[PDB]
Amino acid sequence: ALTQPASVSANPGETVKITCFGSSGNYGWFQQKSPGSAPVTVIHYNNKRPSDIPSRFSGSKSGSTGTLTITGVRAEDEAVYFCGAWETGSATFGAGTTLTVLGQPKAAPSVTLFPPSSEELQANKATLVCLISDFYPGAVTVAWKADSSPVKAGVETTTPSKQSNNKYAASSYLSLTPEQWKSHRSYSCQVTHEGSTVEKTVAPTE
Amino acid sequence: ELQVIQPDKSVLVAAGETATLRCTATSLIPVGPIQWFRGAGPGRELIYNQKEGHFPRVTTVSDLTKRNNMDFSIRIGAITPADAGTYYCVKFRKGSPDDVEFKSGAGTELSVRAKP
Amino acid sequence: DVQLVESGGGVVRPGESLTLSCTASGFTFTSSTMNWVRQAPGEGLDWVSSISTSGVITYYADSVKGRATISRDNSKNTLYLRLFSLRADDTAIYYCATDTFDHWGPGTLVTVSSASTKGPSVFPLAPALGCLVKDYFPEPVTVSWNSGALTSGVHTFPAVLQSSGLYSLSSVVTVPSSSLGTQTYICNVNHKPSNTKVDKKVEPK
Numbered sequence: 001a002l003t004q005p006a007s008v009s010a011n012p013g014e015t016v017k018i019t020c021f022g023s024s025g026n027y028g029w030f031q032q033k034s035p036g037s038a039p040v041t042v043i044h045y046n047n048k049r050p051s052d053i054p055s056r057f058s059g060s061k062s063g064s065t066g067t068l069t070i071t072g073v074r075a076e077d078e079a080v081y082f083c084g085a086w087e088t089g090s091a092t093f094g095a096g097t098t099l100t101v102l103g104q105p106k107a108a109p110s111v112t113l114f115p116p117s118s119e120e121l122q123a124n125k126a127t128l129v130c131l132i133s134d135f136y137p138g139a140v141t142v143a144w145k146a147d148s149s150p151v152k153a154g155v156e157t158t159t160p161s162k163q164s165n166n167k168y169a170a171s172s173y174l175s176l177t178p179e180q181w182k183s184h185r186s187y188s189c190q191v192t193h194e195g196s197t198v199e200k201t202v203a204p205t206e
Numbered sequence: 207e208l209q210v211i212q213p214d215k216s217v218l219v220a221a222g223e224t225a226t227l228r229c230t231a232t233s234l235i236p237v238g239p240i241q242w243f244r245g246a247g248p249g250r251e252l253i254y255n256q257k258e259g260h261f262p263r264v265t266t267v268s269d270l271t272k273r274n275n276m277d278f279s280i281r282i283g284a285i286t287p288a289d290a291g292t293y294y295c296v297k298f299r300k301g302s303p304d305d306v307e308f309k310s311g312a313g314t315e316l317s318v319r320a321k322p
Numbered sequence: 323d324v325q326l327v328e329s330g331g332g333v334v335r336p337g338e339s340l341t342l343s344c345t346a347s348g349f350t351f352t353s354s355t356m357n358w359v360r361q362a363p364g365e366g367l368d369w370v371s372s373i374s375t376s377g378v379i380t381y382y383a384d385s386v387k388g389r390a391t392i393s394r395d396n397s398k399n400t401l402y403l404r405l406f407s408l409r410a411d412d413t414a415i416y417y418c419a420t421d422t423f424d425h426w427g428p429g430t431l432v433t434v435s436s437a438s439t440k441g442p443s444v445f446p447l448a449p450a451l452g453c454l455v456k457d458y459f460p461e462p463v464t465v466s467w468n469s470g471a472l473t474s475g476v477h478t479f480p481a482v483l484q485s486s487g488l489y490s491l492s493s494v495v496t497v498p499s500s501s502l503g504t505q506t507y508i509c510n511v512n513h514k515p516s517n518t519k520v521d522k523k524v525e526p527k
Contacts, residue, residue, distance in 0.1 A: 024306035028423045035364045036462070036480070038417065044424045045246065045310075064306065082367050084423060086248045087307070089381050091357060091369035091423075112450040112494075120445045120454075129447060129454055131494055133477070156482035163477045171479040171492055206527065245355040247422045248372035251379055291353045291375045315353065 004083050004094035010073050011102040018097045020066040020083030027066030029059060032080040032096070034161060039082070043068060075101055075166055106194065107167060109135030113189045113200040116181060126181040128174040128202060130189035135160075138168035145188040146180070208233040210297050212311035221320045225285045226267060229295030229311055231276040236308060238299045240278040244291045246310075253293060254280050257305075287318045324348040324425045326418055331430030332515040333439055333460045337407050344401040344418035344427055351399040355421050358392065358403050360414035361429075363461075370416070371403065386412075408434045433460035433515075437487060441516035444509070448527040452494035453509040455520070457486070464512040465493035472507070502526045 002022035010016040020027060026046050030039040043049055043059030046066065056077075058069045066083055078101045084093040110133045116126040132140060138160035144151045154175035160168040172189065186203045209232040219225040227242065239256035242264075254264045267279035278295060295311035330342040342358070358370040371392040372381045380392045386405065393402040401418055415429040442458030455463055465478045478493035493509060503526075511520040 024301065024303065026307060026422070030367065030423065030426075036415070038428050039367070039426050041424050041426065044422045048422075048424075050424065084367065084369070086369075086372075086422070088243065088250050088252060089248060090383075091248050091359075091372060093359070093367040093369065095366050114447040114452070114454075117445045117448070117454075120456075123443070125443075125456075127454065127456065127490070129452070129492060131450065131452065131479075131492070133450075133494075133496070154485070156484055158480045158482055161480060164474070169477055169479070171482075173482060173484075173490065175484060245353070245375045245421070247355040247357060247420075248369075248381055249355040249357070249374035249379055251374050251376070288376065 002083055002085060002092055002094035005097050006095070007098040007100070009100050009102055010070075012073060012075065014073055015069065015071045016073050016099065017070075018068045018081055018083075018099070020068075020085075020094055021064055022094070023066075023085035023087070023092060024064045025085040025087040027059065027061055028084050028086075029057075029066070029068040030082045030084065030093075032082065035080075042081070070099075073099075073101060075104070077101070078166075104136055104166065107134055107136045108196055109133065109140065109191055109193050109198055111189060111191055111198045111200045113202055115202040115204070121178055121181070124178060126176055126178050128187055128189070130172040130174075130191070130200070131169070132171065132191050133163065133169040134165065134167045135169070135193055136167050138162070139193070140168075140170055141192040142170070142172045143190045144172070144174050145190070146176075146184045147186065208235055208297065208309065210295055210309045210311040212295050212314045214314050215312075216315045216317065218317050218319060219285055220322075221285060221287055221318045223285060225282050225289075225316060227280050227282070227293050227295070227314050227316070229278045229280070229314075231278060231297065234274070234276065236299045238297060238305060238308065241296045241298060242280055243294045243296060246292075246294060246313075250294070253282070285316075285318055287320065290317050292316070324420070326420070326425060326427035328416060328418055328427040328430035329514075331416070331432055333433045333435045333437065334408050335436050336409065336434055339404060339406050340408065340432065341405070342403040342416055342418075342430060342432070346399045346401065346418075346420075349420070352396045356392075356394060356401045357419045357423065358401075358416060359419055359423075360412075360416045360432075362414050363431075368414075373401065405432075410434055431460070431462055431515075435460065439516050440488060441518035442490075442511060442513055442520065444511050444520045444522040446522055446524040447492070447494065448525055449499070450494060450496050451507060451524050451526075452492050453511070453522050453524055454490065454492050455509075455511050456490040457488045458490070458513055458516070459488050460515055461489055462513075463491060465491075466510045466512075467493070467495060468506075468508055469510060 046061040047059040157172040242254040243250040299308040389406040440459040481489040
């Protein structure tokens with residue numbers, strides 16, 4: 001039943017409020033830096049802040065509505081925030097408020113492209129792994145070439161996610177076979193990011 | 207405001223004896239019932255309620271029918287060892303689907319020393 | 323300190339049963355309520371069930387009402403959750419949480435599938451260096467480096483799901499290119515779904 005804002009954007013040092021309604025019960029706010037990683041409770045039972053959590057985080061219930069207040073938002077508060085509410089007998093969560101901090105400059109991507117390893121070939125498999133790091137903001141495009149012929153077969157690309165340095169990184173994979181591996185001039189990874197392109201290469205040559 | 211103070215963080219009571227959980231309302235407004243629970247969160251069990259049922263093992267400390275009553279202290283009788291737990295005195299307010307949680311006292315940890 | 327450790331995670335076959343555990347320390351388990359919440363990968367938190375101090379009251383979400391049993395054992399500070407007639411819907415990371423959702427387990431990924439548990443191959447990425455950790459089922463794996471002794475400049479990527487219904491992932495470190503021959507690099511792959519650990523050493527080529 002809980003509605004909460006799908007996303008809110010804020011500049012560093014500023015006081016953001018996210019709010020949540022849909023319940024007559026008590027509200028918690030749960031942080032989630034990335035998909036997969038565990039939630040961390042920033043506020044529970046309306047306005048209780050765990051000892052751990054820093055003081056810029058404050059909670060309130062008024063009417064049948066909850067409000068999470070970050071006073072002096074920071075680069076590390078950039079996350080997904082789910083309100084949840086419980087009554088005796090039931091609980092529920094909202095769909096999550098992804099928060100992003102405005103600012104943070106437009107670094108371009110850093111591309112390393114690994115060939116297959118002796119071990120991989122020696123076990124008759126071959127995968128190129130294109131690794132893209134340290135780029136902002138987190139929007140990219142990856143294609144592959146063998147010789148200079150585009151390849152759409154056997155490629156898989158992770159979604160951009162945030163390194164420890166507040167910047168984005170993605171990976172992309174070409175599965176193919178030794179036969180295809182030994183046989184071609186030179187495979188490539190073309191990554192685009194705000195028009196501006198980077199383009200690495202390998203060859204079956206050590 | 208109306209404040210719900212449970213002044214005892216603990217009470218240490220003998221098994222088979224009666225246990226008083228103190229709770230007092232500083233004011234009468236907003237209008238709405240008092241409710242005793244064991245635990246917080248969804249699996250809190252309802253231990254007493256003004257407006258609902260009879261509760262066989264709970265007398266109330268004061269007469270609730272009297273008018274300017276602000277004492278909501280409960281006496282659980284025949285305290286068994288597995289009556290240990292944290293109890294929370296909670297004010298609810300008037301609603302429409304009705305009676306929403308207004309304010310909780312900060313809690314009273316019960317503990318049963320098996321003792322003669 | 324409070325510590326919550328789920329387990330039971332892995333693949334189960336559709337329409338069959340499975341039980342999650344959660345061990346609890348650092349607080350007074352008996353005098354404390356418990357919940358389970360789950361999260362379909364890259365979707366939202368969904369309440370699943372709650373349980374009282376005692377264990378006598380159980381509450382459940384429409385998600386699973388009927389076909390789940392929540393249970394506790396206070397004598398060994400452990401919380402459970404049997405789940406019946408498992409569906410593709412139910413594939414999730416499952417977290418136990420205290421009381422008022424004030425502390426959280428790291429979570430245990432449950433994958434409903436009639437695909438057999440495959441442990442991963444592991445290959446090195448010599449130069450920025452990584453290890454490719456390839457052809458494993460189901461998720462997740464957790465790659466550390468030199469054990470927990472190397473952590474700065476370390477990014478473990480998500481998994482991609484290949485045409486062969488098998489997952490591969492990678493972890494990587496940016497490194498000083500003047501440090502090779504001295505500092506050795508070992509990536510330590512954990513994959514509890516196969517009960518398999520794999521430490522592979524990563525040389526320059």
